Amino acid sequence: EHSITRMAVTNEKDASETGDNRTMGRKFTVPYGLYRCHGFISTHFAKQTGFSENDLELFWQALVNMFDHDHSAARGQMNARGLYVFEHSNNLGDAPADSLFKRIQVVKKDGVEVVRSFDDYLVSVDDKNLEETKLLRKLGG
Amino acid sequence: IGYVLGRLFAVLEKIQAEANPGLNATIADRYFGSASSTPIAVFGTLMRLLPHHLNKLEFEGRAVQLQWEIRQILEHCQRFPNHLNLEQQGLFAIGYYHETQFLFTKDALKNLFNEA
Amino acid sequence: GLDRNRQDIGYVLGRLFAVLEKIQAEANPGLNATIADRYFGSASSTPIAVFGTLMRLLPHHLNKLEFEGRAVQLQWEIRQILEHCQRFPNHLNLEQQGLFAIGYYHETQFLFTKDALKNLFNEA
DNA sequence: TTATATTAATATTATATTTA
DNA sequence: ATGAACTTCAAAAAAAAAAA
DNA sequence: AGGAGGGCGAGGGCGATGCCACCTACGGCAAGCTGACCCTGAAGTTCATCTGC
RNA sequence: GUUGAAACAGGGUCAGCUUGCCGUAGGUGGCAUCGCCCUCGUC
Numbered sequence: 001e002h003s004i005t006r007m008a009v010t011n012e013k014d015a016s017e018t019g020d021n022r023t024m025g026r027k028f029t030v031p032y033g034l035y036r037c038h039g040f041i042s043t044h045f046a047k048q049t050g051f052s053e054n055d056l057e058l059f060w061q062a063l064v065n066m067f068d069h070d071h072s073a074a075r076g077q078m079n080a081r082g083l084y085v086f087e088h089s090n091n092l093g094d095a096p097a098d099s100l101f102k103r104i105q106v107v108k109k110d111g112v113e114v115v116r117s118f119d120d121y122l123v124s125v126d127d128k129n130l131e132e133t134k135l136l137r138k139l140g141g
Numbered sequence: 142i143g144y145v146l147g148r149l150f151a152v153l154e155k156i157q158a159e160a161n162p163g164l165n166a167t168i169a170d171r172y173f174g175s176a177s178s179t180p181i182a183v184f185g186t187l188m189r190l191l192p193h194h195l196n197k198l199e200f201e202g203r204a205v206q207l208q209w210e211i212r213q214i215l216e217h218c219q220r221f222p223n224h225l226n227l228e229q230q231g232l233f234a235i236g237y238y239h240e241t242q243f244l245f246t247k248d249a250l251k252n253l254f255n256e257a
Numbered sequence: 258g259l260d261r262n263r264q265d266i267g268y269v270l271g272r273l274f275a276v277l278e279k280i281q282a283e284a285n286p287g288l289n290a291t292i293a294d295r296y297f298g299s300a301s302s303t304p305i306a307v308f309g310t311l312m313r314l315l316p317h318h319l320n321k322l323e324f325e326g327r328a329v330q331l332q333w334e335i336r337q338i339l340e341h342c343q344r345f346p347n348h349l350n351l352e353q354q355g356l357f358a359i360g361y362y363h364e365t366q367f368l369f370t371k372d373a374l375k376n377l378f379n380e381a
Numbered sequence: 382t383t384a385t386a387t388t389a390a391t392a393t394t395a396t397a398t399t400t401a
Numbered sequence: 402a403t404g405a406a407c408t409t410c411a412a413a414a415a416a417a418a419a420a421a
Numbered sequence: 422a423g424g425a426g427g428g429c430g431a432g433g434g435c436g437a438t439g440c441c442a443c444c445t446a447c448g449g450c451a452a453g454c455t456g457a458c459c460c461t462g463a464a465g466t467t468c469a470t471c472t473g474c
Numbered sequence: 475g476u477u478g479a480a481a482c483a484g485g486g487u488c489a490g491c492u493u494g495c496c497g498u499a500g501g502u503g504g505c506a507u508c509g510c511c512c513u514c515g516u517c
Contacts, residue, residue, distance in 0.1 A: 022449035185354030202386030216258025
């Protein structure tokens with residue numbers, strides 16, 4: 001929650017007065033946050049929308065690379081730190097989704113009290129039992 | 142750890158406004174945005190302004206009273222937190238207003254000091 | 258509200274400065290510029306700067322203390338504090354920055370709580 | 382808008398290593 | 402013939418401190 | 422040769438370790454947009470459809 | 475086994491876009507460590 005300053009008022013303010021024109025404002029930043037999105041690419045709705053395997057590799061590329069390209073003063077630096085996809089053999093689910101998401105457990109590093117980077121997190125995947133018929137394809141991690 | 146630092150900010154700004162009656166940049170207007178949300182960034186430096194404000198209090202006994210209550214406030218504080226959760230920046234604001242209307246109570250600080 | 262065994266160098270230095278000013282303000286209570294008023298700004302941030310000079314300056318306050326046993330009272334807790342201070346840190350960490358003010362006011366409370374120092378000394 | 386005068390303050394410890 | 406589809410119906414509705 | 426190699430007691434006394442003020446000034450903490458689309462109705466009839474004739 | 479059943483909040487939508495905390499300000503001015511004290515008394 002950084003209080004930035006602007007050295008130019010925007011409008012003819014109630015206070016755009018004599019000396020300086022200033023519109024301080026706020027530039028909130030996360031000093032670091034390892035956000036864990038869970039995602040579900042369901043075959044059943046891939047049937048009604050025609051979501052192709054091509055349209056899916058485009059989405060994989062998008063997730064891996066979409067912060068390298070969507071930058072701003074507001075968000076500064078965001079990175080895709082890992083995309084662990086669980087491709088199930090059936091258009092049903094081989095396993096419950098959350099059984100596969102707890103499978104990718106991300107914990108702050110051993111003794112970091114506050115996290116500053118991905119280096120202060122540990123993303124341990126569990127590819128030991130999903131071989132039931134499933135595929136964990138690790139795209140970013 | 143947010144409410145007691147709100148109280149701490151209230152006493153700190155009261156001491157400043159008691160030291161300098163007419164201030165253009167009270168430690169509210171200057172340090173609040175980061176004392177509310179980021180107490181180590183500020184309260185480590187508000188409280189270097191503090192001995193000078195207490196020195197400048199024309200009634201040195203009033204300085205003693207205000208320093209006593211900031212001791213009491215800060216006795217509930219074991220460490221200024223690095224960052225105040227959204228839960229506590231509300232406390233800080235509530236703590237600030239609570240303590241600042243305690244200070245601007247009739248005889249509240251004089252009394253509370255005198256029962257110690 | 259005083260962790261006498263905190264070991265947080267900022268907190269122990271705050272405690273140390275609190276007792277240092279307690280001695281100065283008991284050495285001559287009528288004092289224009291206590292070490293809070295003249296040294297605290299860096300004692301909280303640059304403990305090596307002052308805290309050396311604060312203890313050039315300390316034995317003389319202990320002398321100026323009217324009650325010669327009160328000098329032992331306060332010097333004893335200076336030592337109690339300084340067991341926790343293996344070194345005056347060059348620059349107080351920011352956590353320690355704030356914990357110095359914490360220590361100043363925690364130990365100042367401990368000194369201005371009536372029997373605390375005279376009691377706690379007698380358990381040593 | 383208000384409010385705006387001083388807390389606490391009396392001693393720790395204290396009896397000999399080394400000597401072809 | 403029953404039940405969805407459709408066609409009419411009708412035409413918004415609006416605030417908010419003193420202090421004697 | 423056999424010497425004796427100090428014995429004694431003092432090693433601070435006194436007071437002062439601050440005085441003075443200052444610890445801020447100034448102003449800005451927003452601008453601008455949006456705050457939702459869409460539907461879903463009663464009530465009635467039609468109209469397509471079904472059953473029975 | 476004759477008595478309110480059936481019933482979605484849905485489908486989905488970056489809060490963005492960005493903005494110096496600043497310009498700057500002596501810690502000063504100054505203050506005696508002092509006043510003084512047989513190493514003695516003697517073998």
